[PDB]
């Protein structure tokens, strides 16, 4: 795999491919 | 955190994969 | 606003904008 | 869960913000 | 609900969620 | 180009896509 | 309309453009 | 208009709510 | 249609919805 | 990390994450 | 072909790397 | 190439079309 620049809204896309079933947390600063 | 590290600078899936619940 | 089908990435994509800086969680197994 | 709320029935943005943290 | 900072296609997408059955416009300038 | 089934929030991107500032109507009622 | 058109049937780029302003 | 003020600064639900038919 | 600036994945969605089942190949620099 | 099913356009951007600037190719007839 | 295997099939995002170039 | 320039510039449908299998 690749390394990414991800903002927004694409860095939860991401996050949903990585975890599938398993989901995630979001968490941003402040 | 991760939600900066990957927008100011980049961030590898194997990051992306710690916050998996 | 609505009531509507909301899943897989576009679920998510729902709860980045409802939630944003407040973060969330996605936890499909409940 | 949200999936059950939302997916598989129908959900609004407010039902959307109980997954809010 | 939390403020909202939208470009591009992401406007489009935040619009399709908040309207849903009704459908909406969307009217950039120029 | 191609014809394909295009639908819910990927319509409205495709509208988007086609469109862009002479901005589009999503009107699913009709 | 747009979605019997598009979703239920196909469609083209330029049919899509019937829709713009 | 709204295009240009949720991209250059913020917009709520509220005002995006407006723009539906 | 109308021209387009698009960085990162929405340039893959343009490209998935130009041509439909032909398919495509993304080809960044570097 | 995860199995799912990746269809449509969501495969496209799933192939831009794994793949970056490598590229990839999209070629559904095979 | 890539959408058997991940679409009407199920894939890892390993078997994805399989059609980067 | 046409990622660049779709992204420092535009680009048109058209162009994409060349990148179609
Ligand atoms: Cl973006
Ligand atoms: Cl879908
Ligand atoms: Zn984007
Ligand atoms: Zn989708």
Chains 1, 3, 5, 6, 9, 10 share one sequence.
Do not use: D, M, W
């Amino acid at each position: 795999f690749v390394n990414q620049h991800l903002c927004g809204s694409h860095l939860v896309e991401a996050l949903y491919l990585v975890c599938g079933e398993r989901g995630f947390f979001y968490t941003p600063k402040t | 955190g991760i939600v900066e590290q990957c927008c100011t600078s980049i961030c590898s899936l194997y990051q992306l994969e710690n916050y998996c619940n």
